[PDB]
Point group: C5
Chain length 26, copies 5
């Protein structure tokens, strides 16, 4: 359903922001 896609995309956004945090720290 729609809510499952919303949770999935928010989880990808968390993973991408994690990458950005690590790239900035480096």
């Amino acid at each position: 359903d729609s809510l499952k896609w919303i949770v999935f995309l928010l989880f990808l956004i968390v993973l991408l922001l994690l990458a950005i945090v690590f790239l900035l720290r480096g």
Copy 2:
């Protein structure tokens, strides 16, 4: 409906975060 818009905008946010990750890395 609103949920279709929400999913679409979250997907655009994923794409823009991917672009940022790629710009940071390069």
Copy 3:
């Protein structure tokens, strides 16, 4: 109602990420 604010704020987030992409690319 909440759903209309949610769509509006996601849309501002899209615009703000576009601005970040633009600044990084410069």
Copy 4:
């Protein structure tokens, strides 16, 4: 109310991205 909390956190995300945009301009 979960929906109201969602509006609030999206609003903080807008604020934080505006802060980032400002820091990136200087």
Copy 5:
């Protein structure tokens, strides 16, 4: 609850953007 997961992930996204703001300042 799906809404609870959404609130949780949005909170993580806030914390990650706070981390990014702090890294940009120093």
